[PDB]
Design an enzyme around this catalytic site. Structure first.
Site, PDB file in Angstrom:
ATOM      1  N   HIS A  79      16.235-109.673  66.186  1.00 32.12           N
ATOM      2  CA  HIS A  79      16.818-108.393  66.556  1.00 32.12           C
ATOM      3  C   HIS A  79      16.392-108.029  67.992  1.00 32.12           C
ATOM      4  CE1 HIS A  79      13.031-107.621  64.455  1.00 32.12           C
ATOM      5  NE2 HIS A  79      12.848-106.546  65.196  1.00 32.12           N
ATOM      6  N   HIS A  81      14.122-106.128  69.345  1.00 37.76           N
ATOM      7  CA  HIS A  81      12.762-105.768  69.752  1.00 37.76           C
ATOM      8  C   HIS A  81      11.989-106.734  70.643  1.00 37.76           C
ATOM      9  CE1 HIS A  81      12.298-102.374  66.634  1.00 37.76           C
ATOM     10  NE2 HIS A  81      12.811-101.914  67.780  1.00 37.76           N
ATOM     11  N   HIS A 142      14.921-103.660  58.683  1.00 42.08           N
ATOM     12  CA  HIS A 142      13.849-103.227  59.576  1.00 42.08           C
ATOM     13  C   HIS A 142      14.453-102.557  60.785  1.00 42.08           C
ATOM     14  CE1 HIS A 142      10.584-103.306  62.471  1.00 42.08           C
ATOM     15  NE2 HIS A 142      11.473-103.813  63.310  1.00 42.08           N
ATOM     16  N   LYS A 164       8.283-108.423  54.645  1.00 45.74           N
ATOM     17  CA  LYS A 164       6.844-108.195  54.807  1.00 45.74           C
ATOM     18  C   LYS A 164       5.996-109.319  54.103  1.00 45.74           C
ATOM     19  CE  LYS A 164       7.196-103.945  56.538  1.00 45.74           C
ATOM     20  NZ  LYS A 164       6.406-104.406  57.710  1.00 45.74           N
ATOM     21  N   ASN A 173       6.150-100.021  60.966  1.00 49.63           N
ATOM     22  CA  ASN A 173       7.049 -99.548  62.035  1.00 49.63           C
ATOM     23  C   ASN A 173       8.544 -99.302  61.711  1.00 49.63           C
ATOM     24  OD1 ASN A 173       7.605 -99.040  64.944  1.00 49.63           O
ATOM     25  ND2 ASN A 173       8.672-101.021  64.827  1.00 49.63           N
ATOM     26  N   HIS A 203       5.831-110.936  60.550  1.00 50.52           N
ATOM     27  CA  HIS A 203       4.377-110.776  60.771  1.00 50.52           C
ATOM     28  C   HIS A 203       3.659-111.179  59.515  1.00 50.52           C
ATOM     29  CE1 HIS A 203       4.917-108.767  64.602  1.00 50.52           C
ATOM     30  NE2 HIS A 203       5.991-108.249  64.033  1.00 50.52           N
TER      31      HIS A 203
HETATM   32  C1  LIG Z   1       2.938-103.869  58.493  1.00 50.29           C
HETATM   33  O1  LIG Z   1       2.761-105.189  58.976  1.00 50.29           O
HETATM   34  C2  LIG Z   1       1.926-105.455  60.102  1.00 50.29           C
HETATM   35  O2  LIG Z   1       0.561-105.079  59.850  1.00 50.29           O
HETATM   36  C3  LIG Z   1      -0.027-103.946  60.504  1.00 50.29           C
HETATM   37  C4  LIG Z   1      -1.527-103.917  60.159  1.00 50.29           C
HETATM   38  C5  LIG Z   1       0.244-103.980  62.024  1.00 50.29           C
HETATM   39  C6  LIG Z   1       1.703-104.257  62.298  1.00 50.29           C
HETATM   40  O3  LIG Z   1       2.168-103.777  63.508  1.00 50.29           O
HETATM   41  C7  LIG Z   1       3.506-103.813  63.846  1.00 50.29           C
HETATM   42  C8  LIG Z   1       3.918-103.312  65.079  1.00 50.29           C
HETATM   43  C9  LIG Z   1       5.228-103.555  65.495  1.00 50.29           C
HETATM   44  O4  LIG Z   1       5.597-103.500  66.830  1.00 50.29           O
HETATM   45  C10 LIG Z   1       6.217-103.879  64.563  1.00 50.29           C
HETATM   46  O5  LIG Z   1       7.529-103.881  65.030  1.00 50.29           O
HETATM   47  C11 LIG Z   1       5.833-104.171  63.229  1.00 50.29           C
HETATM   48  C12 LIG Z   1       6.851-104.264  62.160  1.00 50.29           C
HETATM   49  O6  LIG Z   1       7.391-105.485  61.987  1.00 50.29           O
HETATM   50  O7  LIG Z   1       7.148-103.313  61.459  1.00 50.29           O
HETATM   51  C13 LIG Z   1       4.453-104.356  62.958  1.00 50.29           C
HETATM   52  C14 LIG Z   1       3.952-105.098  61.788  1.00 50.29           C
HETATM   53  O8  LIG Z   1       4.638-105.841  61.115  1.00 50.29           O
HETATM   54  C15 LIG Z   1       2.497-104.921  61.421  1.00 50.29           C
HETATM   55 ZN   LIG Z   2       8.657-107.018  63.716  1.00 48.59          ZN
HETATM   56 ZN   LIG Z   3      11.153-105.261  65.195  1.00 47.26          ZN
END
Ligand SMILES: CO[C@@H]1O[C@@H](C)Cc2oc3cc(O)c(O)c(C(=O)O)c3c(=O)c21
Ligand SMILES: [Zn+2]
Ligand SMILES: [Zn+2]
Ligand code: NA
Length: 227
Positions: A79, A81, A142, A164, A173, A203
């Protein structure tokens, strides 16, 4: 999971597919790990997502050619971002073909971020010298523009941030999220890929089809806990 730089890690899923983790800082979320895949075939590489910036991307681009011996000819971002096209300008300086959801194109164009060159609106089958790469837009999650990349010959699914990881309790986020759709979109993902061997999220740790269910719950929970 080998390290190839101080901020870049690699893991191997199959002889042709790889996943990497690049560690970056984000104002408001701290030291955070972003994933992307690397797919190889007859010395050519397709890169899905790029680290948040041109430096990490370049390092990553040379490791590929140096270690896997492959010219990176293809790019597809999940996407709009930073942790998806953050280093696309670099890739462009080097003549890389870019592909994306048409809505990802429109969003980068109006925010003055480099723009990919070919949009699709429903699905795109991209051929890395033979090997198919199936991109689908099944609804917002997302982010409004988010897609998934499916690998028919590896049963590997790159889900991006709509999915997730198994240790995540937070929805995180949701600034550009489409929470209304998110839940209908996840169902479409599980229905379409029952046989996925590997599933990689935007992530965190990768795994099997159970990240789809884990995520459907973190979200439903959020819809209720705030409603
Ligand atoms: C919640 O999962 C992850 O763990 C926490 C501790 C920290 C974190 O930071 C993020 C910051 C983003 O810029 C973003 O775009 C996402 C996102 O993908 O929503 C996430 C993300 O994935 C996570
Ligand atoms: Zn992301
Ligand atoms: Zn994103
Ligand atoms: Na990335």
């Amino acid at each position: 999971s080998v390290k190839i730089s101080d901020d870049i890690s690699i893991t191997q899923l199959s002889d042709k597919v790889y996943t990497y983790v690049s560690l970056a800082e984000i104002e408001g979320w701290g030291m955070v790990p972003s994933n992307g895949m690397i797919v190889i075939n007859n010395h050519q590489a397709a890169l899905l997502d790029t680290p948040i910036n041109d430096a990490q991307t370049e390092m990553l681009v040379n490791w590929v050619t140096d270690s896997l011996h492959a010219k990176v000819t293809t790019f597809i971002p999940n996407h709009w971002h930073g942790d998806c096209i953050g280093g696309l300008g670099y890739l462009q300086r080097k003549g890389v073909q870019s592909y994306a959801n048409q809505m990802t194109i429109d969003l980068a164009k109006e925010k003055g971020l480099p723009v990919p060159e070919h949009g699709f609106t429903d699905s795109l089958t991209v051929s890395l010298d033979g090997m198919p790469l199936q991109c689908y837009y099944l609804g917002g999650g997302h982010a409004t523009d988010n897609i998934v990349v499916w690998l028919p010959t590896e049963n590997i699914l790159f889900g991006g941030c709509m999915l997730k990881d198994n240790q995540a309790t937070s929805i995180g986020n949701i600034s550009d999220a489409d929470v209304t759709a998110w839940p209908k979109t996840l169902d479409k993902v599980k229905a379409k890929f029952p046989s996925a061997r590997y599933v990689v999220p935007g992530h965190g740790d990768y795994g099997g089809t159970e990240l789809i269910e884990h995520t459907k719950q973190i979200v439903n929970q959020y819809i209720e806990s705030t409603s």
